[PDB]
């Protein structure tokens, strides 16, 4: 059972997020302040300056030598039980595809832990669960959103060879992509070219246009393009320098000086109120809140709020979590959909309606669902 004052600490940490979100839904839908080109300049700022400094602020204050490794294995066994059953679904059943393996992995295992999970669980359970949610944000940024980037690059590099080398691709020796090309999925004309050698060998060169390969060829092609999406990504620099500093700042006690700890904190203090303002600007620019259909908005919000936590009840118990760490682990799994899984689905067109329903409609029912777990778990 919960006390009525502990319900006030949740509202103290969550109602400020929805105030910032309805003021931005109002300033576009209702009172017409922002032009949709002006409105896309605030999303630009948040995606590059505010969230990479908000995620730096949390990761650099983490202690990487005192991470709860029993709790941390229950979150990384959710994402193996899910990802094994998807691997044993696309290979067995003939209707399974790789476009749904990426969608069902985002919809069921990757929540919004950074902007709404750290403020939410800090009010519900205290300062330790706001320290455990930082440890998940470290592992999503550095492992699970950099695996999911391999699954989008593999999805792009498999279409281009099935469309253009349908009967010859068993003889490709190397694939060189020109350095101009960043995404080879449905965006650029991509004049590819092959080089027939003296014995059936084949050198492929993907170029920019104007007017089954061996696994040693594809896994050289994927790692090139993953590297070109990883140094242009602003949250890799937030995650590299955040982990590099906290491995130094917590062994030799080197406290970061107040020139630099305040130069970062002048834009990172913007980051949490600007993320919710940017998220409410996005749900106003879309024509419908439920966009994917009503039979798929009940599917996007059953993978998230039911299949999400019910696979961390078979994983958080097999690891050995009990008490409050079981209750923190289930409630963090029922958080709404993270936005970085949508940002990949917008770029690659792997169901951008289901992953925009689940972000937008997930936020609106996020609070009365996680409060429903917070009542049922304590009883």
């Amino acid at each position, epitope marked *: 059972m919960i006390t009525a004052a502990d319900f006030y600490h949740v509202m103290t940490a969550m109602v400020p997020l929805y105030v910032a979100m309805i003021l931005a839904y109002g300033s576009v839908k209702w009172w017409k302040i922002f032009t949709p080109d002006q409105c896309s300049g605030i999303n630009r700022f948040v995606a590059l300056f505010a969230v990479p400094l908000l995620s730096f602020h949390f990761i650099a204050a983490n202690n990487p030598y005192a991470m709860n490794l029993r709790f941390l294995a229950a979150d990384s066994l959710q994402k193996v039980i899910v990802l094994s059953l998807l691997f044993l679904w696309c290979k067995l059943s003939r209707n399974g595809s790789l476009d749904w393996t990426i969608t069902l992995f985002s919809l069921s295992t990757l929540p919004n832990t950074l902007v709404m999970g750290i403020p939410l669980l800090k009010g519900m359970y205290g300062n330790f669960s706001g320290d455990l949610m930082v440890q998940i944000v470290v592992l999503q940024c550095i492992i699970w959103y950099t695996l999911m980037l391999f699954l989008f690059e593999y999805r792009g590099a498999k279409l281009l060879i099935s469309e*253009q080398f*349908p009967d*010859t691709a068993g003889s490709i020796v190397s694939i060189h992509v020109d350095s101009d090309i960043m995404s080879l999925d449905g965006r650029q004309p991509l004049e*590819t*070219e092959a*080089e*027939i050698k003296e014995d*059936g060998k084949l050198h492929v060169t993907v170029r920019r246009s104007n007017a089954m390969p061996p696994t040693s060829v594809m896994t050289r092609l994927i790692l090139i393009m993953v590297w070109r999406k990883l140094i242009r990504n602003p949250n890799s620099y937030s995650s590299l320098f955040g982990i590099t500093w906290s491995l130094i700042s917590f062994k030799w006690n080197i406290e970061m000086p107040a020139l630099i700890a305040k130069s970062i904190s002048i834009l990172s203090d913007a980051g949490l109120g600007m993320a919710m303002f940017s998220l409410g600007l996005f749900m106003a620019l879309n024509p419908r809140i439920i966009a994917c259909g009503n039979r798929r908005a009940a599917f996007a919000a059953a993978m998230r709020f039911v299949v999400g936590p019910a696979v961390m009840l078979v994983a958080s118990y097999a690891v050995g979590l009990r008490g409050v760490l079981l209750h923190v682990a289930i409630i963090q799994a029922a958080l709404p959909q993270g936005i970085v899984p949508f940002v990949f689905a917008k770029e690659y067109n792997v169901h951008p309606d289901i992953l925009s329903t689940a972000v937008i409609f997930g936020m609106l029912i996020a609070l009365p669902i996680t409060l429903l777990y917070y009542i049922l778990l304590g009883l």
Partner: nanobody
Amino acid sequence: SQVQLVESGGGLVQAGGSLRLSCAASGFPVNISWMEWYRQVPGKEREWVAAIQSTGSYTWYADSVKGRFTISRDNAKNTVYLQMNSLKPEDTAVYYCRVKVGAYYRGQGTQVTVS
């Protein structure tokens, strides 16, 4: 099959001679005709020359060599020739064909040299 291009016809020739290059296609799937030809000097910024495209209706000749380079198709032999006349001295570059079967496959072996 291990599909292979064969190119020949290149050699040493003075200005104003006559050449007839070869592009022997063998081993392909169903070939949509977009067999091209272009030049390549050791300097960059290459430029396209000809085409024998879809029905032989219109070819794409360059504006500098329009109407003077004769291109022709034999579907039985699967070989497209490129006849050259009034050979200008800026034709020492390599001339190789670019058969398009969805991805442009091309070879390298000629020695078109005009002195």
